Nucleic acid binder design. Structure first.
Lengths: 98, 91
DNA sequence: AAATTTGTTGTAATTTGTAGCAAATTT
DNA sequence: AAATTTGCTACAAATTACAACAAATTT
């Protein structure tokens, strides 16, 4: 049949292992490190906007990449993403994607 | 100038930071490449699911299970936070 | 010329926030 | 014992979806 591909491996950045050997690795692992570092490199100062902080860093390059793919076509990009065309528009405005 | 980043070695064994968004973008460049016109039905709920999970895990790790403390770190509401833990069943 | 997509509605469906209380847990 | 956190629970408010349409643009 077809081999399984668990949701972790659907979106993967490529890393380098103990030997000089390139290898895919789930994206969530990168989010994991970004925060391991974010906490380490912060040390004591409180934060109150971590979700929105994270959200932005993700939302932008998604929108960026989907609009690239639909060569600017908002209707289809909004279908691809599964959000309404109206909320896509609002996001893009938020991120000055215009 | 930028707070969310990830370490990257290059061919000269020099580790070096770069923003998480660059990494996200790659992920997608690659996603699309694979599918040859297979339509994507819910790409947002997918990505979001790949980002929420590890964020939930790490704040809960940081706040030592303290939901009240986490939900205030993130800027969401405890209710929401509980509801998202349910979504991925981290409970 | 035809089919699609945009920009713009008001309106309704859903999700998140608010607060407040007794019970459980940490301090 | 006192303080903090949990697991609820209406209800309010903010966000998202809907659906319609002329006008703009693409095919």
């Amino acid at each position: 049949m077809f081999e399984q591909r668990v949701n972790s491996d659907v979106l993967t950045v490529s890393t380098v292992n103990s030997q000089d050997q390139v290898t895919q690795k789930p994206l969530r692992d990168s989010v994991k490190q970004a925060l391991k570092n974010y906490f380490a490199q912060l040390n004591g100062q409180d934060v109150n906007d971590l979700y929105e902080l994270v959200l932005a860093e993700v939302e932008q390059p998604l929108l960026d990449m989907v609009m690239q793919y639909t060569r600017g076509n908002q209707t289809r990009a909004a279908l691809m993403m599964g959000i309404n065309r109206g909320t896509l528009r609002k996001k893009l405005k938020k991120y000055g994607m215009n």
